[PDB]
From a paper:
Here, inspired by natural and re-engineered protein–peptide systems, we set out to design proteins made out of repeating units that bind peptides with repeating sequences, with a one-to-one correspondence between the repeat units of the protein and those of the peptide. The proteins are hyperstable and bind to four to six tandem repeats of their tripeptide targets with nanomolar to picomolar affinities in vitro and in living cells.
Reasoning that proline-containing peptides would incur a lower entropic cost upon binding than non-proline-containing peptides, we decided to start our experimental characterization with designs containing at least one proline residue; in most of these designs, the peptide backbone is in or near the polyproline II portion of the Ramachandran map. For the polyproline helix, there are roughly three residues per turn, and, probably because of this, we obtained more designs that target three-residue than two-residue proline-containing repeat units. Crystal structures reveal repeating interactions between protein and peptide interactions as designed, including ladders of hydrogen bonds from protein side chains to peptide backbones. Our results show that by matching superhelical parameters between repeating-protein and repeating-peptide conformations, and incorporating specific hydrogen-bonding and hydrophobic interactions between matched protein and peptide repeats, we can now design modular proteins that bind to extended peptides with high affinity and specificity.
Numbering used by the authors:
A (entry chain B): -9 to 9
B (entry chain A): 0 to 303
Amino acid sequence: PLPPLPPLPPLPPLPPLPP
Amino acid sequence: MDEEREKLKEKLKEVLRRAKEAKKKGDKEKLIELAYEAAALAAWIIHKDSNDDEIVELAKEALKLVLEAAKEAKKNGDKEKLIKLAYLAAAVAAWIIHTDGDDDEIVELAKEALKLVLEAAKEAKKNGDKEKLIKLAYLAAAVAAWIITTDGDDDEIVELAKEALKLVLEAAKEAKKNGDKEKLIKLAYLAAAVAAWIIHTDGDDDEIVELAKEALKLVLEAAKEAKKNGDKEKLIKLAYLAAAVAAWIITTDGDDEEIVELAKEALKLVKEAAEEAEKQGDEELREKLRYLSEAVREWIERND
């Protein structure tokens, strides 16, 4: 059959920390 | 082998053939239909990590089809098909990002899909639909979060990330007014991640500091709801984000009475999450939360 509409993507990784 | 991979491969390659025929022939509404089908085929064929390069090219060509169908639909003047195509473009973009990681032409394609969603979200606010506004803002922030990581040097990426952050903050405010809190939490996650990367890659200005403050108070209230829902896992990541955003503001812009208030609240949030992560047993997160808690205390307590 035809696949469903694109779902929401996974969350992006955690951001880095200040030096 | 995987018979479903093969069928999805030739089925998607069919749709691109028919779409290139309908474009050549001159009918536009079938080209929009074929764009819908290409996006669903593309996002599903890459729904998990695949090693075949032919799979990722069809996904990129499907995205290119969605963008082509988006610029024709804007000239015909159908707002609702433009919003759906914008949704599809970003979703397909971010799934190509998730699977293949970094190749060369996804940067320019994802950038084009990001500008498209920012327009649709403005147009969705004009229509007044809150469901589509949240989803479009979710995609804009998810895509902008990635682009600033891998690109960062491009001048246009700054403005698009700032517009995406400003967009998800508005969507997180209407999600608070609807009632669903799980969607608020994910929007706050994106708000912090983008805000942290903007200060990371591009420094501060008058507007970045103001947006980051809003994203910081947003994740603080989101982590307050995560503690009510009794979810340890999302709580410790929200506390990480709160400290991170608070750390990037203080170490680059400094702190007034408003920033120290939010920093203190985030600091007590991290100490609670550092306790919960050591219970659950997360060695990497346990030592990064200690790094944040110490770094934030040292900066706050320098006038002491």
